[PDB]
Amino acid sequence: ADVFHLGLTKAMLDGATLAIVPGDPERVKRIAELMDNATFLASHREYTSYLAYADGKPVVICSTGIGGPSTSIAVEELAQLGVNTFLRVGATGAIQPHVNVGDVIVTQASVRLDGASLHFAPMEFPAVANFECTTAMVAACRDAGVEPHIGVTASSDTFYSMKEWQDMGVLNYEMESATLFTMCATQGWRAACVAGVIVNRTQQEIPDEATMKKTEVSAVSIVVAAAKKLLA
Amino acid sequence: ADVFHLGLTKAMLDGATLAIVPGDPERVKRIAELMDNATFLASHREYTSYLAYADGKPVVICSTGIGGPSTSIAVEELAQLGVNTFLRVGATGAIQPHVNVGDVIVTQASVRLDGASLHFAPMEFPAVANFECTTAMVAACRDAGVEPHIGVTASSDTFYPGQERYDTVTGRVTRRFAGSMKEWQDMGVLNYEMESATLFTMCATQGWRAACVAGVIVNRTQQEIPDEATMKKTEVSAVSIVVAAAKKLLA
Ligand SMILES: [Li+]
């Protein structure tokens, strides 16, 4: 392979410059299949990678695993293979009372509660998403009839102080976006992040299973839509 | 499943209270298969789990993924399923001149260059391995004719910057991690890896036992390229040693 973990060479990406980077190896295939000619590329460790074509252009779809360390490896190695744009999609839990199950969040920037971002920039640096990529995500939500909650996500190193984040308007919690955003911002790659809200931590009620699958479907559909806007 | 990620129920471990926790999901079977009656349990995301029997007692073998965050989930969920001892086995790169490809490191404690350890203790708390499990690891090494290097490992949240790797894209490391490898070498730090400070801090603070052993597959101080066959032999050796140590601790 040309890189140490993903088991990929550059020719395998067929020129892809954009990656969709979900957390779960097991979700890669189904996201690739929303595009054309989905093709398994490799699977090592938690990194499952597919190629597919979005409006005729090559996109790589590659799992990050859970957390900033494993993500950092996937992002750095995809960048070595020419990817300069990275769109995260994921399912998240909201911490704001009126961000409901089935809503979508576009993360514009993240609270850096992760260790890995600190390998890329001192803490003072903002874990901020790329403006154009975030714009595309928001456009893709709107095209789908969805008004995204756009704002700040708490990005942490353990599965998941909360009140502190709520009073500061933080929308949700996840584990990879601070790392993603900081490493990409600091090295000249573009990143954005969309997530379907599958649960609301302020809420009594347990989320409906069918709602949660529909929501995740929506988020994957949005990110693919955003990827086509950016490769237009 | 009784836990959120591993896809396991308590009954599936059949009473096991000791886990062998390699990084790589594709190594779990091989380890399970050095013991008796190895059985596939589950595979969800980066967690592949098997059960097997060491001289009659069940051992769970479960991958952690790379890094403290993914490891913390596996460790927390295995403890919920009743595991109280976690033996990590890995392959690693030495940073000390005389620690040769083929040697073995037993990590007694780790430099906490990770973020997940901070969820379990403030940075002043030592990322220290349990003394009895480290003792079993050393004995297992010696039984295999191997004098392990016992010392401090640097445990990092990146493969690249926090490990002072410059054969990257930008070929730049943040100030924090510039000169840092040589810093660790001067402090007698044996090697780098990415999970043991989380493992050891979360275990120590919550009353579980952890130890870690690793085969040296590369020496970052040597120009000589590591040999393919030695690396496999070293990896086989690290895995038999951790199986031996589990046997000692369950005897
Ligand atoms: Li992982």
Automatic annotation (TrEMBL), chain A:
MF terms in GO: uridine phosphorylase activity
Gene3D superfamilies named among the record's database cross-references: Nucleoside phosphorylase domain
Protein keywords: Cytoplasm, Glycosyltransferase, Transferase
Family that this chain belongs to: Belongs to the PNP/UDP phosphorylase family.
Uppermost EC category: transferase
Annotated localization: Cytoplasm
Subunit structure: Homohexamer.
Main localization, broad class: cytoplasm
GO cellular component: cytosol
All residue ranges annotated as the Nucleoside phosphorylase domain in the record: 17-214
Function field: Catalyzes the reversible phosphorylytic cleavage of uridine to uracil and ribose-1-phosphate.
GO BP field: nucleoside catabolic process; nucleotide catabolic process; UMP salvage
PROSITE patterns reported in the protein's UniProt record: PNP_UDP_1
Name of the protein this chain belongs to: Uridine phosphorylase
Domain of life: Bacteria
Keyword field contains Glycoprotein: no
UniProt EC number: 2.4.2.3
Keyword Disulfide bond assigned: no
Reactions catalysed, as given in the entry: uridine + phosphate = alpha-D-ribose 1-phosphate + uracil
Pathway: Pyrimidine metabolism; UMP biosynthesis via salvage pathway; uracil from uridine (phosphorylase route): step 1/1
